[PDB]
Chain A
Amino acid sequence: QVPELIKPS
C-alpha cells in the first residue's frame, strides 16, 4: 500500500 496518485488526463 503506497500512496495513491492523481490520475492523468
Chain B
Amino acid sequence: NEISSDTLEQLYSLAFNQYQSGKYEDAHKVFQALCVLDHYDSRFFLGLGACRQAMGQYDLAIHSYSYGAVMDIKEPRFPFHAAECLLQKGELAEAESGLFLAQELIANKPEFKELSTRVSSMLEAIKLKKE
C-alpha cells in the first residue's frame, strides 16, 4: 500500500524529536516502521541503529548500520557508528576496518572535521594495543 505520501517526513520528525528527548524505545518503534515504509532511505536506518546503540544493543545496531551502508556506500556515519559498537564488543580488528573505511569516505570533506578527529583518536588506540 505504498502510495503513502510524504507524511514520511512527519513521521521522521516525530521519531527524530523523540530521540532528542532520550525516548529511545519509542523512537525505535517509529524508525522501525519507517524502514518498512521506505527501505531505501538511509536516515531511517541511521535512526534505527542509533536507538539500538543508545540502548546498548550493539549487535542490533551494527545490523541496521550495515543495511544503511549498502544503500548509501558513500556515507561515513555508518562505518563510524558500527566501529563504535564493534569497539564496545571488544572486536578491535573489525572496528579498525570500520574506522579506516570511514576515513576514506570522509577524505578531506570540511563538514566531517570533528568526526575525523574522533576517527584518528580511535585508530591510534587500537594501533598501540598491537605492540
Chain B interface bracket (under 10, 10 to 19, 20 to 34, 35 or more): 10 to 19
Q: What CA separation (Å) do A2 and B24 show in the bound complex?
A: 10
Q: What CA separation (Å) do A9 and B19 show in the bound complex?
A: 16
Question: Total A-B residue pairs with C-beta atoms closer than 8 Å?
Answer: 30
Interface of A is mostly: loop
Chain A interface bracket (under 10, 10 to 19, 20 to 34, 35 or more): under 10
Contact A5 B54 (CB under 8 A): no
Closest-CB distance, B37 to chain A (whole angstroms): 15
Q: What CA separation (Å) do A5 and B65 show in the bound complex?
A: 13
The chain A residue with its CB closest to the CB of B61 is A3
**Top 4 nearest A-B pairs by Cβ distance?**
A3-B50, A8-B13, A2-B54, A6-B43
